[PDB]
Curated annotation (Swiss-Prot), chain A:
Segment forming the signal sequence: none
Subunit structure and binding partners: The RNAP catalytic core consists of 2 alpha, 1 beta, 1 beta' and 1 omega subunit. When a sigma factor is associated with the core the holoenzyme is formed, which can initiate transcription.
Protein's job: DNA-dependent RNA polymerase catalyzes the transcription of DNA into RNA using the four ribonucleoside triphosphates as substrates.
Protein name per its UniProtKB record: DNA-directed RNA polymerase subunit beta'
The gene coding this protein: rpoC
Organism of this sequence: Mycobacterium tuberculosis (strain ATCC 25618 / H37Rv)
Induction / repression: 6-fold repressed by starvation.
Family: Belongs to the RNA polymerase beta' chain family.
Amino acid sequence: EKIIYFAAYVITSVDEEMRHNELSTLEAEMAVERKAVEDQRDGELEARAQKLEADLAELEAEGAKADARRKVRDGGEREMRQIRDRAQRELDRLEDIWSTFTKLAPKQLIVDENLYRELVDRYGEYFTGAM
Amino acid sequence: EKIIYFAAYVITSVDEEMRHNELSTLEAEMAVERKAVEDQRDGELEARAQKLEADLAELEAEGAKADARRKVRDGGEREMRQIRDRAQRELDRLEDIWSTFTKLAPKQLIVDENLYRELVDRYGEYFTGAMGA
């Protein structure tokens, strides 16, 4: 085999009717979780933007040269890109968990343990599978 | 015509590209709003059930008669039905607004003023409508 992993878990049973019944409640719970990620992110971004505005205003009061101002400006932008990028990672991971849960069907092979373990804690009741 | 209404609005154009692009975001946003209704509902149901239990206990300590304890039981169940029913009407309305927006297409005739007004406030950028027939 050309697929290399620690362990695989096959999917045998999915309670489609039960999942179907609670899907709306489950989709809302994921959107609440997603929005708390986006809200934390927006809060961090605004705080960083304020810090950068005050840092530049400080350099100006001190009559610093353009190069010093540019470095602060560039540094702030990089930090804010990191905040966006880190948050995107967390959002993409939740999208993957939700996507795998929603399209969960028997004869599927789950070959990343962290993903498998995420499916169990969040949706253990709706499925059964074996190593 | 045998269809009766105050005033109707033809959809003239739908910005499908943007709807398609913002759909995922819009959908989570509706689901959050939907859940806020459901959470309020559940809180009220749970608190009201506690009340009914305590109220029955109180009739017990005062040694009230059965027909008295029953009317308070039935009045409790009634109110709890009303909590469930009222919130369901609100959920039904949110479901309709969202359903209408997703399947919204040129030439569609929107004939309830309150629905139109909700569509415009929630998703005004996405579509164009004219009152004239």
